Ligand SMILES: O=C(O)Cc1cccc([N+](=O)[O-])c1
Ligand code: NI
């Protein structure tokens with residue numbers, strides 16, 4: 266019964282999931298000066314035109330916007346990837362304050378939040394099988410800074426009062442995730458893991474260099490969510506980010522010079 270507190274937070278997770286101290290854990294600090302530009306990298310293809318969003322769920326640690334992943338409707342390909350990766354969900358990690366919240370850091374800088382678009386490799390048939398493979402998932406990571414509002418985020422923000430507590434869901438159809446992407450698809454990539462239990466080492470991370478801007482008011486609404494279930498004492502859903510982990514024997518590659 267894990268979480269983000271003093272008593273059950275990241276620094277405890279290794280007792281249940283020894284892989285927490287493994288060789289390819291996430292997130293990491295991205296040292297921009299030491300990331301090497303990789304010309305082998307194939308260009309990134311994000312094909313979200315046919316995406317079908319279904320539902321938004323408060324899972325007790327974040328909220329997930331879930332997609333129909335029963336066909337190739339929203340797919341990621343290219344970049345460092347071999348093959349086709351299907352969108353299953355996106356979620357965010359965020360802070361109690363604007364000065365923290367992202368999982369990845371960039372030269373030690375923390376952003377206010379980070380968006381994760383989670384995709385699984387279709388060669389494995391479903392998500393559950395894909396998470397058991399070293400190349401099972403591709404997560405596209407996007408940093409959020411506080412400034413102007415992000416218009417394409419407002420639909421998400423406005424439904425959050427309907428999913429305040431753990432286990433609540435709401436219908437969330439017709440949401441276009443293209444409205445959450447920055448202009449540029451320049452990226453860093455490295456092999457890593459999920460950042461909550463069970464911490465599986467199944468992720469190719471693709472972290473975009475260009476942040477998106479969201480307003481103060483938008484991020485404030487994230488911070489009104491609750492970790493707890495209805496009828497339990499209120500504990501605000503904030504600081505649901507794992508801190509940077511050791512890079513160990515990994516290289517971070519850049520798609521750009
Ligand atoms: O890495 C995370 O944010 C945690 C996490 C936990 C469980 C599933 C997830 N997913 O990628 O579908 C992500
Ligand atoms: Ni538990």
Ligand code: NI
Pocket residue numbers: 356357358381460
């Ligand atoms: Ni995540």
